Design a protein around this nucleic acid. Structure first.
Length: 47
DNA sequence: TGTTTTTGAGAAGA
DNA sequence: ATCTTCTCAAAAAC
């Protein structure tokens, strides 16, 4: 189908950055992906 | 010009 | 204003 937005490596990198306090808004602008996507890969209640 | 899988804007939150 | 979740047209790839 449509290529995913981020691979396991990226997912890790991000999941770690998100747990360090990085705002999804930022990480979103940075990793070239939309915010709703991040909340999907990592619900705020999933940290 | 057709199905599939995933994206991302935006809508709505006892 | 912020934050989070959820839907859903449709991009993205073949």
């Amino acid at each position: 189908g449509r290529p995913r937005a981020i691979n396991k490596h990226e997912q890790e990198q991000i999941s770690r950055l998100l747990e360090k306090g990085h705002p999804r808004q930022q990480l979103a602008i940075i990793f070239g992906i939309g915010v709703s996507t991040l909340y999907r890969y990592f619900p705020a209640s999933s940290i």
